[PDB]
Design an enzyme around this catalytic site. Sequence first.
Site, PDB file in Angstrom:
ATOM      1  N   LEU A 102      60.083  23.754  -6.413  1.00  0.00           N
ATOM      2  CA  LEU A 102      59.883  23.251  -5.515  1.00  0.00           C
ATOM      3  C   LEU A 102      60.319  21.789  -5.515  1.00  0.00           C
ATOM      4  O   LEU A 102      59.115  21.278  -5.318  1.00  0.00           O
ATOM      5  CB  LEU A 102      58.691  23.770  -4.057  1.00  0.00           C
ATOM      6  N   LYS A 103      61.020  20.668  -5.105  1.00  0.00           N
ATOM      7  CA  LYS A 103      62.076  19.646  -5.898  1.00  0.00           C
ATOM      8  C   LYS A 103      62.436  18.705  -4.487  1.00  0.00           C
ATOM      9  O   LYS A 103      63.387  20.050  -3.727  1.00  0.00           O
ATOM     10  CB  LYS A 103      61.769  19.523  -7.310  1.00  0.00           C
ATOM     11  N   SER A 104      62.035  17.484  -4.239  1.00  0.00           N
ATOM     12  CA  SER A 104      63.189  16.689  -3.108  1.00  0.00           C
ATOM     13  C   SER A 104      62.747  15.786  -3.253  1.00  0.00           C
ATOM     14  O   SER A 104      61.284  15.070  -4.011  1.00  0.00           O
ATOM     15  CB  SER A 104      63.286  17.365  -1.850  1.00  0.00           C
TER      16      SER A 104
END
Lengths: 316, 487
Positions: A102-104
Site C-alpha cells: 500500500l503506497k502513494s
Amino acid sequence: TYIPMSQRRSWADVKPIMQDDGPNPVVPIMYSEEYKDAMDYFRAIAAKEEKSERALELTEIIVRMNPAHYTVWQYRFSLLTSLNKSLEDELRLMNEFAVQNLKSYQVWHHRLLLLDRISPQDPVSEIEYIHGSLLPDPKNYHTWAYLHWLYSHFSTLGRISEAQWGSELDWCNEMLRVDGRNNSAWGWRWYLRVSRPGAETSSRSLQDELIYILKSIHLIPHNVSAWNYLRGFLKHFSLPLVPILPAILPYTAFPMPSDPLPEDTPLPVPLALEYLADSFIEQNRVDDAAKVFEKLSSEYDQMRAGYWEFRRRECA
Amino acid sequence: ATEFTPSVYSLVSKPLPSNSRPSATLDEQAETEDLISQLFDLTADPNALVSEHGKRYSGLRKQEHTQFLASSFFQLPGKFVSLDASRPWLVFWTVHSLDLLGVALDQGTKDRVVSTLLHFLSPKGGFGGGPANSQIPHLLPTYASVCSLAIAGNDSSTGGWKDLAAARQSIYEFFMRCKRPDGGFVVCEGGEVDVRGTYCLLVVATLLDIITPELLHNVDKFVSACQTYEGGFACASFPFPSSEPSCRVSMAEAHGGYTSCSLNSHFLLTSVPLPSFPLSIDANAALRWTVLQQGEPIEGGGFRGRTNKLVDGCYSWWVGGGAPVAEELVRREKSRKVIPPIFNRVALQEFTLVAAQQDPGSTGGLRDKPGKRPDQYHTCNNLSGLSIAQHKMSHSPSTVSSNRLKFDASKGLPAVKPVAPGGGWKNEDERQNARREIWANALGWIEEEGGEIIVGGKDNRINTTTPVFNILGLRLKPFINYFYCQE
Ligand SMILES: CCCC[C@H]1CN(c2cccc(OC(F)(F)F)c2)C(=O)CN1Cc1cncn1Cc1ccc(Cl)cc1
Ligand SMILES: CC(C)=CCC/C(C)=C/CC/C(C)=C/COP(=O)(O)OP(=O)(O)O
Ligand SMILES: O=S(=O)(O)C[C@H](O)CNC1CCCCC1
Ligand SMILES: O=S(=O)(O)C[C@H](O)CNC1CCCCC1
Ligand SMILES: O=S(=O)(O)C[C@H](O)CNC1CCCCC1
Ligand SMILES: [Zn+2]
C-alpha cells in the site's frame, strides 16, 4: 459476508451522506459496496467534524482500499494530533502498509509528517528502516527524496553526528558496489560529499573524490552515471579538464584504465569524446572541438546527430 | 528536414555494453532492449513507400484509440478506485487526447464534462480530485480541471468559464494558503511540497489573471535550486535557515517529470516584470540532460525518465515536450551574451507508432512499453509527445511583439485583492504592464512553417499542442482571451 454500516450498533446515530456528483457525471468509477459505504459515512463524519476513535478506524478502512486518497489521509493526521494518539504506533502501522504494498505520495508524506511531529532526538532507527525498505526497489524515487529530507531536516536541528554521516557514506559506497549503475545512489553521494552544507571542501577531499570517480569510470567505462558525476564535479568546483585528460584519452580511440580494457568495452565511448571536445574548447582550439562534435554527430552518437551538429556549429 | 534525425531502422542496433560488469540495472536494460527490438523487427519500417509483406503495419490506429478512451463517458471498472482522487486527470487525459486525435465531442457530452468538474469546485477555492462534498482542493486537480474546462467549456451561461471567472478571488486565496515562505507550495492542506504543485499553480494563475508579487516571492529561487549536477531537476529543494535561507539544496535525482515541471515553471516566470526575477537556471545543462535521455536505436528512440532507467512512452511528453523550452532558454542566453532539430524527431515518432501503441485488433490505447497494458495517462502523454515531434514548436519574439501591440489594458476582470496589504502591484501602470507581458508571452508559441515531419505519411498527423500548457493553441487562445477580456 459484509455487514453494512447502517446495521452496526456503533454507527446507528450517524446519517450517511451520498457523493454529490450531479445526476450523470463523466468518468464514474464502479465502486465496491464496502468502499461506497465507508465513504458515505466518512462524508458524514467530516461534515460534523467528528474527531473520534471510530472516525480514526474509518479512515484506516478507507486508505487500505485506496492509499492515494489524500483527503482521508489529511483527516487521519488531524485525528492523530487532535486525539494525541501514539505516533510511534502509527509509524508501525505505516511499516505494515509498505509490507502489504500500500503506497502513494500520500503515505510517504504521512510518514514525513509523523517524523516531523515526533521530532526524535536521534533519527537513527528511521534511517535504518529507510535503508532496509530500499531492497525491493533500490531506485524508489519517493524513498530517496524522503532520505534526503530526513538528513536535511534533522541536520538543521543539529541532530546528525559525524559518526552518523560517516556510516551513511559507508552505506552509500556499498549500494554503488552492488550496482554501480544505480543513479539514485550517485545522487545521494553528491549530497553527502558535495551539496550538504556540512560537507568538507579541502585539497584532500577534492583529491579523494576525483580518485573515486575515475576508479568508477575505469570499472564501468560505459556507465553514464559516472560520466555525469565527473562532469558535474569538475564544473561545480571550476576544475580544469585538461590535467585529467590522460585518464580519459584511452576511451576516445590519478587512476588510469586497465592496460587491457575490460572485455565488452567497444570504443570510442561517446561521453569520453564529449570530454575531449570540451577540453579542446578549454584550450581555445575550436576547430579541434568542432571536428570531435562532427564525428559524434555523424558516426559515434547518431541518435543525437542534431544536438552534436548544434555543438559543432557553435565552434565554427 | 531529416538529415540529422536518422530513422531507427537506418542505424545499427546494439545492446548497451556490459564492460564485463553485470548488475541488476543491466539485467533489466538488456531484457527491455530485447522486447523493443523484437517488436521493431516484426514491424514494417514506417518510412517505406510500400509496406512490407508479412510484417505489422505501424500506422496510428486513431479509431482504436478513440474507442479506448470512450469508456470515460460511460464508466470505469472498480479496480481503478486507486484513481478516485484523480478524476479530473481522467477527464483531462481523455479530452486532450480526443483534441489531439481530432475527434469532436457533441455539446451534450461537453456540458456533462463542465457540470461534473464544477461539482469538484469548492466555494472557498480550488478543485479537488472529486466532489467538493468528498474531497478538499488540490493544486494538481485544479490544473487538470482548468485545462479540461478550456477544452470542453465555452463563454455562455452553461459553459463553465463564467463560473471560473467568479471563482478567481477564492482560487487565489487557496493558492496563497498553499504558499511557503521559501517559495514552495503545498499541493493541499497538509500536503507535500514539490515542483508539480508550482507548475500546476503557475499555469492556472497565468491563465486566470491572478498573478501578484506576493504570490511569486521566492518561487523562482525554489525552482532554480531544484536543478541537479546532471542538469535536469529534482522534485524539490530544501531551505537551510539563516524566507531568507542561507542556501538551498536539491532533494533527489534529475527526473523527466520534475524537469518538465521546473522548465515550464521557470519559463512562465520569465514573463513577469519583477526586478532581478526570475533567478536564472543553467539552460545549457538542462538542454544537455534532455537530449541525453533519448534512447538508443535498440530501445526504439523513446525517452527514459532518468539516467540508467528504462525508456517509457510517457516521457515523450515530459522530456520531449521540455526540449523546446530548454532550447528557447539557451537561445536567449546565447543572444544575451552578444538550425537542426535538437532531439531525434523521427526516432521518437517511430517509438510511438511501433512500440507505444497497443497491439492491433485489441483494446486500443497507448502504453509505457511493450508488455504493459495501455491506460489513459500513457495515451495522453504518448500523443502529446508525438505532437511535439511532428510539429516544430518555438517561442517567437516577433509574435510576442505583435501580441503586445494588440493588447488592450483598459479591458479586464476585477483585480485580485492581496492577502497582505503591500502584496499587490505598486500601481496600475505596473499591474497593466504585468498583464500585458504575461498574456503576450503565454500566446507566443508557434509552429514553424515548413518544419513539419510526419513519419509514415500524413494520415499519422495529429494536432499541434502548446509547449508549457499542453493544450491545443485553438483552445488556449479563446480561453486566456476570456479571462483577460481580449478579443
Ligand atoms: C494508470 C495510472 C498511471 C500511473 C502513473 C501516473 N500517475 C499519476 C496519477 C494521477 C495523476 C498524475 O498526474 C500526472 F500529470 F499525470 F502526472 C499521475 C501515478 O501516480 C503513477 N504513475 C506511474 C507511472 C507510469 N509511468 C511513469 N510513472 C511514474 C509516475 C508518473 C507520474 C507521477 Cl505524478 C508519479 C509517478
Ligand atoms: C504536472 C505533473 C503531475 C507532473 C508529474 C510528471 C511525472 C512523470 C512525475 C514522476 C514522479 C516520479 C517520482 C516518477 C518516478 O516513478 P517510477 O519509478 O515508477 O518510474 P521511472 O522508472 O520511469 O522513474
Ligand atoms: O484505428 S484503426 O486501426 O485506424 C480502425 C480499425 O482498424 C478498423 N478496422 C477496419 C474498419 C473498416 C472495415 C475493415 C476493418
Ligand atoms: O468550501 S467549503 O464548503 O467551505 C469546505 C468544503 O467545501 C467542504 N468539503 C469537505 C471536503 C472533505 C469531506 C467533507 C466536505
Ligand atoms: O498523404 S500521404 O502522406 O502522401 C499518404 C497517405 O497519408 C497514406 N496513408 C495510408 C493510406 C492507405 C491506408 C493506410 C494509411
Ligand atoms: Zn510512464
